[PDB]
Each structure stands twice: as C-alpha cells, then as structure tokens.
C-alpha cells in the first residue's frame, strides 16, 4: 500500500543469502567427511544439545570461493550488521536436511525425546490420511501435494526442535591473516548506536542470581473438540485465555472451556547477572558503571561471581521507562544477550584433555630442575627471600584432604603468616600470589566490616526471594584469601578467622539467619610487629600483638628481619636500578615462566593423591621425638618458642604430602621429608643475627 506506511529499498537481499547459506551448510570439507554432517548427525543421535557456528569458516569459505570464481556475496558483514534475523533464517536452513534414523530410541532416555517423537509420528499419519481420502475421489502429482499441504493444520516446525543455536565471534588472528567484530570494548564505550550488532565486552561479574524456569509456549486442552490450542508469550507478563479458538469449537453454539497442562509446554532456563567496569579502563575521576545480561539455554551455570570474563553477544532493547512523569517517548532501556563466554584465568579442575597439553608441560619437565625454577618464577621482580617463595609454592599446591569414614575430615591445606617490617617487600607477594591463583580475594585491614566478609541477607530483585548475598570469604573458597594488617582487625573478625581455622565452618545466629555456611579457604596473613621494629632486648610475643594459640594455628610462621649489611647492597642496587633502567630483571642464565603455562602445570599437578609408606613412618616418628624432646627442655619466654604442638606434626606430614605431588610420582621418599624438616628448622629461628 502506498501513501501510508511507505516503502524503501536497501542493498540487502535475503534471496541468494539463503541459497549460499545452504551451500555453506553442506559443502565444507576442511575440518572424515564434511564438518557439519558429523556434528549434526551427532545432534540427531541425541547426545548433544548446542551447535557452535563460528565466524571463521564463513570467512575462509569466502576467500576460497573468491579465488575459485565466481564472486561470493558478502555475508560476514551481513551477519555483523543485523545478527538477529539470522538465527531463525539459519535454523530453518538447517532443518531441511537431517540424518534421521541413525540409532533406535533407548528405553530409558528422557521425556523430551519421547514427546517430540510422538509429535513427529502423529504429524506424519495426519499428513498421509488426507491424501488417502482425496486421491480416492477423482476427478504431475505436485498439484495434489499442494492441495493436501494447505488443508491440514499441523504442528509448526518452531516447536519440534530439541536444540539451540549459538554464534562465535572471530579472532584477531584470522582477521590479521587475511587483512572488528570483536574489538574488546568497555562499558563506557558502548554508545547508543550499536543496538543490534554483535559486540564484545569485558569486566567483573557481580550478583549472579539463581536459575528458574521461564515459559515460552503454553499448551491448553479443549476437552470437547479435542484440539491443543497453543499460545506464544513474548512479554514479561501474560494473560490466560477463554472458551476456544479452534475451527470446531468455533462456529458452533456451545463453546467448550479450556485449561492448561505442563507436560506439553516448552521451557527454558533463565538467569541474569551484571557486569561492572574493570576499574583499569576508567578515566581519571569516574566511577564504574554496570550493564545487565540475560542468559538463555545451554550456556547457563558458567558465570561464577568475582571473575574476569569476555562475554560476546548481541545488544537489544527491552521496553521500560522509570517514573511516569519522566517519560518523553519512547525511551527504551537496553540489555545484552549472551552468546559465548570466554574466561581469563581458566579454572581448575574443569579440564580433561592432555595430549596437546604435554607439548607445553613436557618442555618444563624436560627443562630440568622444575621445582627451584618455579620457585624462582613467582614474583621475580623482587630480590632475595628464596625460602619464602619456596614455601608459597607449597601454599599454591596444597592438598591432600582425607575422609576417614566416620566422617570427620582433615585438612588438607596450609596456613602461612608473615612478620617483619617494613621494607622487606611483603605486599608485592600478596598482590602477586593473589594474582596467580584463580579465585583469589585481597582484602585490607579496615577495610571490610564484620558483616562484609561474612554473608548478609538482602531482598532480591526480579527473581525471588531472600537469597544470602555472600561476603569476601564465601566468595573465595577453594582459593587463597590474602589479608593485610592483621593486627588492626576488630575482635569479632578474629573469632571469624578462628572459626575458619577449624574446617568448613562459619556459624551465624543473627536476626534472620541460623545457617552454617561452608568455606574451604586458605589464609595467608601479614602482621606487623610492635613499634618500632625488632628489639632483641624485647622478648618474642612482646613485640607480637597476637596470642600463641593463633601462633599454634599457623603451622608455618616466618619473620623477615631488616639488618644493614655491606655485601648485599650492591647486588640490590644493581638489581633495582637495572630495572628502572629497563623492564625485565633476570639474566645469565634464566627466563621467567609465563604465568598461564605455570597455572597449566600446577593445575595439572593436583590430580595425583600420593601414598606414604613404612620407612617414612620411622623417620617422621623419630624426628617428632627429636623436636618434642628438645623443645620442652627450655620452658622459657626467651628466643625459644615453646612448645612444638602436634599441629606441627600434622603440618609436617602435610608438607611432605604437598612436596610429593610436584614430583608427580606417588613416590614419597626421604628427600621429601628431609626437605620438609629443612623448611621447618630454617622457617623459624632466623632472629639470631
């Protein structure tokens, strides 16, 4: 119609793009036979649910067709400009061809399979009945097919699907090889002129909610006519309906009445979260913003709170404005749909493959002297203190927990303090190791309140209700919780830490909580001595503001002295000035291991569980008789530290079991336990000079 709602032409065609997308779907040989008959046959064999259609095979197909002749119609930019029509267009391009019968149905499979099977079979018999009727009423056969295909109501192919479909953006590598769709943007950068494209962000996830079902189509029954009246729901709120809308309970006097059912609808998981700004890509005087994300389908349960993530998705509107008196029409309030999630700091132990990984791991293993090299590698940009780095590698490894069938549980973990002041560069190690380990939270002294690092209760928006929002310690479990300035903590926080020293437990009896939440954390602390520093006139624990019970809960305690000495100063000055002169320290003859390959090594190392033996029983027992024997013949408040509790015995077996894993051997030997006794006797007792 002209003159009201007029027309426009544009260069974009939807005619040959469908044909080209069919040709791409069939003939692609690069990755036995073709690529998508294998994966799509795997889908129809009912062992898979998602389909990843990348944006690299399309571009390589365009350079191949561009060099063969003829000219190929530009399709990649056509996806990148619109990116919403192509899921439905692409998916009805898939459904013409599918290798159906490749395996008979199992009996015990599922319920969604058997529902879609009965819909398909009933659809066939309905389609064959009418051509068994009209064909016997005469009076090439394409015409009779066109007769039957338009006098029969069917289940539409939007409902018999079983899978989902997800894109995947293109690298800088493939765009560099042949010469945009994924430039990593920030949340300030998203102008309001990207609505519809396919973009990429990065930030820290905060406040990820629960997973609860949301409806897509609703299936009623009519009870008299016998139909099944569907209804699609697009909006936030819907409304139920009344008497009927069929073609038999309509045009009659006596309409029926319909009521719903839940084993014939179609559900989908649903979960929303928020991205905060990364706080490194901000201007000078500003505050981090936020931007919502919906998540549908298979991609759910991959957004853990407190991470660094690279979400790529398309960017739609969703209608709302705020107060009614502020509206000007037709303000829209955007969100970000999710398509494919790629994390930095990949989390152990969510990996299985080993074959390609050994090409990098076996280089470190065949490099020779793996252990002291890795001990050199953690935070190389300081000088000195090889023993502290040596112990903190054993913090990052950890292990091994043990259930004894009661079931009372033992740890399983190491707890390390640091002492001395001020210029021994202790904060650099805390930022360092709370940057190497995934799931690592760095909290200062004050700082967090008592309710900041325990959980709290708050009302939840749209999904309901009353979830316990976690604190710092509940966030970082099975990780490392660095702590600055341990002396300035409020005393309630001290009892919280002492409750973490017994395993698993924080207990709350406040105004709305009776729970016992879990925490499997590891604690590294850094306490300062009494003012000013290190008087050998003053006794131990005189210059320490902490009770010796808390000294007993730490199996490993350190102290970093500060004594002026002539010889080390030139090495230290050449070290530091050698890096302000440049940006890399080590030379002659060493290279630092990159941290990603190191996390691959340590992440590989935690799947061993070594087993002790009988000679190490004798050696551990006799060494404990030594330490117990000489530790209690002093009994004074002197530089000696009494009284070598059996937590040192459990801690030294636990350090032996930790050192045995880096040999990757299940071969607990005497160099193991001898190394552990070396770190015990050298660990403390450094205050002699």
């Amino acid at each position: 119609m002209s003159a009201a709602l007029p027309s426009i032409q544009l260069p974009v065609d939807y005619n040959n793009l469908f044909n080209e997308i069919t040709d791409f779907l069939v003939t692609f040989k690069q990755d036995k036979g073709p690529k998508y008959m294998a994966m799509l046959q795997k889908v129809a064999n009912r062992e898979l649910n998602s389909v990843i259609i990348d944006l690299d095979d399309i571009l390589q197909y365009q350079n191949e067709k561009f060099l063969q002749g003829t000219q190929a119609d530009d399709l990649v930019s056509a996806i990148q400009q619109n990116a919403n029509h192509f899921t439905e267009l692409f998916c009805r391009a898939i459904d013409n061809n599918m290798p159906l019968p490749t395996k008979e149905i199992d009996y015990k499979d599922d319920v969604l399979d058997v529902i879609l099977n009965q819909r398909r079979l009933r659809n066939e018999r309905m389609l064959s009945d009418r051509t068994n009727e009209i064909r016997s009423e005469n009076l090439m056969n394409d015409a009779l097919r066109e007769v039957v295909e338009d006098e029969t109501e069917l289940f539409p192919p939007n409902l018999t699907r079983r899978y989902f479909l997800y894109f995947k953006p293109l690298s800088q590598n493939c765009a560099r090889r042949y010469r945009i769709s994924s430039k990593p943007l920030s949340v300030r950068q998203i102008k309001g002129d990207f609505l519809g494209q396919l973009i990429t962000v990065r930030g820290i996830i905060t406040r990820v909610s629960d997973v609860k079902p949301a409806v897509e189509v609703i299936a009623y029954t009519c009870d008299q006519c016998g139909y099944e009246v569907f209804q699609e729901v697009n909006s936030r709120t819907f409304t139920p309906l009344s008497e009927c809308t069929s073609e038999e309970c309509s045009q009659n006097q006596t309409k029926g009445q319909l009521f719903m059912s839940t084993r014939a609808s179609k559900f989908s998981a649903f979960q929303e979260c928020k991205i905060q700004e990364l706080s490194q890509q901000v201007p000078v005087g500003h505050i981090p913003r936020s931007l919502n994300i919906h998540v549908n389908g298979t991609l759910v349960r991959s957004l853990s709170p407190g991470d660094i993530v690279d979400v790529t998705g398309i960017f739609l509107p969703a209608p709302y404005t705020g107060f009614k008196a502020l509206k000007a029409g037709l303000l829209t309030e955007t969100y970000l749909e999710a398509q494919f999630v790629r994390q930095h700091k990949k989390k152990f132990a969510s990996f299985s493959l080993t074959s390609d990984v050994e090409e990098r791991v076996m280089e470190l293993i065949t490099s020779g002297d793996v252990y002291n090299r890795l001990a050199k590698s953690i935070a190389p940009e300081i000088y000195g203190n090889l023993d502290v780095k040596k112990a903190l590698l054993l913090l990052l490894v950890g292990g091994v927990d043990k259930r004894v069938g009661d079931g009372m549980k033992i740890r399983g973990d190491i707890n390390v303090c640091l002492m001395g002041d001020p210029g021994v560069a202790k904060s650099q190690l805390l930022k360092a190791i709370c940057k190497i380990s995934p799931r690592g939270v760095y909290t200062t002294g004050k700082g967090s309140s008592g309710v900041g690092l325990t959980a709290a209760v708050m009302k939840d928006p749209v999904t309901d209700e009353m979830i316990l929002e976690g604190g710092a310690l509940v966030l970082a479990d099975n990780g490392i919780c660095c702590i600055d300035e341990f002396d300035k903590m409020d005393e309630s926080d001290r009892t919280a830490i002492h409750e973490v020293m017994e395993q698993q437990t924080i207990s709350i009896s406040k105004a709305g909580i009776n729970t016992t939440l879990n925490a499997r954390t590891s604690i590294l602390a850094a306490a300062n001595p009494l003012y000013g520093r290190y008087n050998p006139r003053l006794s131990p624990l005189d210059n320490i503001n902490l009770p010796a019970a808390l000294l007993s809960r730490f199996d490993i305690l350190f102290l970093m002295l500060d004594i002026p000495s002539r010889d080390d100063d030139e090495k230290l000055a050449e070290h530091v000035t050698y890096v302000h002169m440049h940006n890399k320290q080590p030379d002659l003859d060493f290279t630092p291991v990159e941290p990603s390959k190191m996390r691959e090594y340590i992440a590989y190392a935690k799947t061993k569980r070594p087993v002790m033996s009988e000679a190490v029983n004798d050696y551990v027992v006799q060494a404990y008789i030594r330490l117990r024997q000489d530790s209690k013949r002093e009994m004074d408040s002197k530089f000696s530290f009494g009284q070598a509790t059996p937590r040192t015995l459990l801690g030294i077996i636990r350090l032996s079991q930790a050192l045995a894993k880096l040999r990757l051997a299940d071969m607990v030997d005497i160099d193991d336990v001898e190394e552990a006794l070396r770190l015990v006797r050298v660990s403390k007792e450094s205050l002699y000079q």
Partner: protein, 604 residues
C-alpha cells in the same frame, strides 16, 4: 513543500547568509571539520582491507552587525534559531544533517543564578550556573522504525516525534507502533537499521559560595541531547546556556483538577561548559600560543633556571630555599613506570613539614593550593569518607547501591593538602596506609566489593608533641607517630626558631616593605613541562646513587634512623624530576648531585 514557507523565513535566511559570508573564519572552521572527517574516513576505508557537527558563534560580532538580529535572538529565540540553522546547513551542503549552533557569550544581563530565575524571564534565552546533582542514567530514544515484510519482500518505514524537538510547537499526532499492514501480513521488525539517539537529564542547584546565609536551596532541571551526553560528573561546576521552555497543559484540561499549579518548566539544550573551581575540576585547558612555547624554548636552555624558579614561589616569604626546591620537585612529580604482567611502581613525592608555630607552615600550603591544579584541602576531620565513599545511595528507580566519591578518589593526579596531621585518629591512618603505597582503595562494605583507583600526592604539617622542643631533648619522638608513617614519607623537613640579630633585620625590612618569574607564566611552564616528554635514565647516574646509598647506610645507620630501600627509590624519583625540569631527554650526573644534596639537607 513542507508547508511552502513564507517570505519572512526567506528574509531571515538571506540576512544570516549575508552575515555568515561577511566574516570568514567560520567557513574555515567548517572546512576543518569536513576535511578531518574525510581523511579519517579514508583511513577507515583504505588501511583496513567522529567529531560532532556544531560551530561556535560568538555574540561579539552581531552587536556590530545588526541590532535587530541581536535583540531578536535574546527575546524570542523560537523565531530566529531554526532559520540560521537552515542557512548553515545550506552552506555546508553547498560547499561539499542538523548542524546546530552554540552562542558563546557575553550575555546581555542574563547572567542569572537559579535563585532569581522565575518567571517573567520565561521563554527567552538564559545563562545559568551552579552545582550539578543528581545526574540520572543514559537512555536511548527511538526515532525511525524499519520493518521487513513477509512474504512480498519490501521494507517499510515510520517516523516519530515528541515535545522536546525543535523549539516551535506542532499539532501532535500519535502513531501506533505498526504491525499488520494492509493487506494483512505479518511485519517482523528489525534492528540495526532503525536509528536511535541518546537522552539524559540533570538538575542544577545554586552555588554554595554564592548562596545566602542559611536557607533552603531551590533548583531547576535541564534536558540534554545527542552530542552532549556525559560531560559533567556530579560534583562539578557548570555553566548552562539554553532556552527556558514551559511545556505541558496545566490542569486546565479536565475540571475539578488536582496538581494545583501546572506548567512545569525546564531548559532545552544547549552548550554545557564545565568551568574551573577553587577545589574541584581540572584547569588544564590553559592556552599555549606559539609565542609562549617560543619563550619557554628561549628560557629553557639556561644554567640558573632551577635557582630562578627556586626563588619564584616566594614573593613574600624570607628564607627556606630547600623547601621551595622540594615543592617544585613535587609539582613535576617524577614519572610513572608500569611493568608488564606485574604491579606498577610509584612515581610522585610525599612531603611532611614539622616545626614550631608561627613559621609560615600554614601560609605555604595555601600557595600550593592556588598555583597547582586539582588541590583539595582536608583539615582535621575527616571521618567518615575521606579515603572511602561511604556508599550512602538510596536510588529511587530500583534497589541498587552506588558509590559517592570522597576526597581521595576525586583528587586523582593531584595534590592533597592535609593540615593538623597529628589530630587524625589511627582509624583513618589505616586508610592513609592503604593509599600512600598500595595506590588503591578496596571497599567491600555491605555491598559491592570493588577496587577503584586513586594515586594522589600528600602534603602534611604536624605540630610537635609538647612545646616547641624541636632540638632540645632528642629527635626520638618529638613527633611521635610511629613508625611506618615516618617511613612512608619521603622527606622530613625539621624547622626551628633560632634567635639572632641579623635574622631580625632581614625579616624586619622584608615584612615592612611587603605592605606597600610571574606565576601565570609559571603554570604554563609547568604543564608543558609535564606532558612533554618523559625521560629515560642512563648509565652516567647509577654509580653516584649506588656509592651514595651504601654511604648513607654504612654511616647514617651510625648516626640516625631509619633507612630502607624506599630511600633508594626516592633518589631515583628526584633524579627523574630534576631531569624533567631542564626539558631534557636523558639523565646526567648533575641530577644525582642535586638530589643527593637535597637528601643530605633533608636528613642531616
């Protein structure tokens, strides 16, 4: 023809055409914008295989061009702005779109604060300044739809308008978001081709430095537009020039009315300028003509300029050269080196004065508060929320917690001038321990655990413990804030009150003649010294600070206390800053000599 417009509109368009072709700088500005976007488009269309559209017009010229057009704009602007915009789009289309204007002034005795705004100034052109609070969120607005049809394969089209459009009125016609054209076919919509244009509204309170004694404040609200989104963070000081429109039907429509007085008011557009304050907001917009950089190059190559600029910050203060040298070395600030895959290393300098009363220790910090840029002064208290944000947000639209920056976040790249440093309690001194080396502020209160950034520089001036006893008993706790706080600070200037007779003379005629090189050149020296260029350290300066540092340990560990590696790092920082002063590129032995002497006088 839209409405086949009158010959009046032709008269305004022709006259403003004649003015715009009279003075010919504006044609060159349009040429600059057009060429810049052209060559940017050539880079984005040639290698891989932005600027807005508004011209700043000053109201100087129209007073000497036409009195009619001058006093025409400042009385009834809904009759005179759309013709001039039409003629400017005519010129810009003819030389090679909206093409709005600015009207930078010089305004006509409409310089009024929003205390005295209403209401006989209504529907004129008004300039308003004040504080910005409580800026809302940015939302996109829809203008043009595009629909794909099925199955005939034709796109479609629709427009939308509002009341916050161009400044006239129009008989309104709403229009349903379309679906199911004639004849009956499903219209599946699209995105990516349908346009969108941003929208944001902020409110303005009058100035507290201009306000009356104590009364409630009264405030108005401003709507912004496409190319004016996100200029002003809340807390700035903002000049707004716009049109004081009054839209809405004020309860005269339906009888037995509530909302007793209608006719809500606002301001449209147009040209939000942020301006300099005494304590918040950057002043780095200061102009640098070629005459000025030619003069900087003229004075740049002498051999006494550190001793000239030493005695420049004291026009009326006797003595204390080494303090002045330390303050210039603070204002240059060193260089910031961030490592690869590690943590950065700190760049600036932190200074504590301590000494007897009546020693011009408080007079100096106001002078550093004036000459620098982004100075923020905190005296005494303090708690709560200097180093933090306190998170007190009660956002009305939805349950959400925002942050409201204190004094430490807001003074980024700046100078914090704290007075009476002993009166601070230790609970805030925890936050000063967090700022002065870690350079980050972690807040995990209720809440949202964050890690923002703040990298300020600190000057303090504390009193002695009891009396003026700065030399009498011992240096061991005449100050008594032990001990890490003594180590974080780089320099410890210890100022005494010696009595003499020649000193009484030299003080006397100075103070007497005061009652009866220039700084607005000096800050233009400073910012050009700051942005260009960073130096690198060279081989000639390592051995001086190595020998000097082993000297200071082996002997100053026999004299005084304490010495850490932080002294070595501050030696490197003062070397780099004194290299920045002479506008060089490399590092000479001269720098290590000067910084060595400053640390000798500072410690001994």
């Amino acid at each position: 023809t839209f409405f086949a417009p009158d010959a009046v509109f032709g008269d305004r368009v022709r006259r403003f055409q004649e003015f715009l072709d009279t003075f010919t700088s504006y044609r060159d500005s349009v040429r600059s914008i057009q060429v810049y976007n052209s060559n940017n488009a050539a880079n984005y269309n040639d290698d891989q295989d932005i600027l807005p559209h508004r011209i700043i017009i000053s109201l100087d010229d129209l007073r000497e061009f036409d009195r009619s057009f001058w006093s025409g704009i400042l009385v009834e602007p809904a009759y005179f702005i759309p013709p001039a915009e039409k003629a400017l789009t005519d010129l810009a289309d003819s030389m090679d779109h909206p093409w709005k204007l600015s009207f930078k002034g010089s305004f006509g005795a409409h310089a009024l604060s929003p205390r005295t705004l209403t209401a006989q100034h209504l529907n004129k052109l008004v300039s308003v300044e004040g504080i910005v609070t409580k800026t809302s969120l940015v939302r996109p607005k829809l203008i043009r739809s595009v629909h794909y049809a099925a199955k005939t394969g034709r796109f479609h089209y629709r427009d939308y308008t509002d009341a916050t459009t161009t400044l006239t009125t129009r008989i309104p016609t709403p229009a349903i978001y379309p679906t199911e054209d004639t004849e009956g076919n499903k219209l599946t919509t699209e995105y990516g081709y349908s346009t969108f244009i941003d929208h944001q509204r902020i409110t303005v309170q009058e100035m507290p430095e201009m306000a009356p004694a104590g009364q409630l404040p009264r405030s108005i609200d401003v709507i912004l537009d496409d190319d004016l989104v996100d200029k002003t963070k809340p807390g700035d000081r903002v000049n707004v020039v716009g049109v004081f429109k009054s839209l809405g039907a004020g309860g005269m429509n339906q009888s037995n009315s509530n909302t007793l007085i209608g006719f809500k008011t606002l301001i449209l557009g147009n040209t939000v300028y942020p301006l300099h304050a005494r304590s918040t907001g950057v002043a780095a917009r200061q102009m640098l003509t070629d005459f000025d950089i030619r003069n900087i190059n003229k004075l740049s190559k002498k051999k006494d300029i550190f001793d000239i600029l030493s005695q420049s910050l004291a026009p009326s203060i006797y003595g204390h050269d080494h303090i002045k040298k330390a303050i210039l070395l603070m204002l240059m600030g060193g260089v910031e080196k961030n490592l690869e895959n590690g943590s950065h290393l700190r760049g600036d300098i932190n200074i504590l004065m301590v000494g007897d009363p009546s020693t011009a220790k408080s007079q100096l910090l106001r002078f550093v508060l004036n000459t620098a840029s982004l100075a923020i002064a905190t005296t005494g208290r303090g708690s709560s929320g200097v180093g933090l944000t306190a998170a007190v947000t009660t956002d009305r639209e939805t349950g959400e917690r925002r942050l409201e920056a204190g004094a430490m976040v807001l003074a980024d790249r700046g100078v914090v001038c704290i007075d009476e440093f002993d009166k601070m309690t230790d609970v805030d001194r925890v936050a000063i321990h967090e700022v002065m080396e870690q350079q980050t502020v972690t807040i995990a209160k209720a809440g949202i655990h964050t890690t923002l950034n703040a990298r300020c520089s600190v000057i303090a001036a504390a009193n002695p413990v009891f009396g003026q006893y700065d030399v009498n008993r011992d240096p061991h706790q005449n100050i008594a804030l032990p001990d890490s706080l003594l180590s974080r600070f780089d320099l410890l200037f210890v100022v005494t009150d010696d009595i003499n007779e020649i000193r009484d003379r030299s003080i006397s005629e100075h103070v007497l003649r005061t009652h009866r090189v220039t700084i607005p050149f000096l800050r233009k020296y400073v910012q050009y010294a700051k942005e260009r260029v960073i130096p690198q350290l060279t081989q000639e300066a390592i051995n001086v600070i190595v020998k000097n540092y082993t000297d200071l340990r082996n002997d100053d560990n026999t004299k005084k206390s304490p010495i850490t590696a932080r002294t070595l790092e501050t030696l490197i920082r003062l070397a780099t800053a004194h290299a920045k002063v002479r506008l060089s590129k490399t590092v000479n032995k001269v720098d290590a000599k000067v910084a060595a002497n400053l640390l000798r006088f500072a410690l001994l």
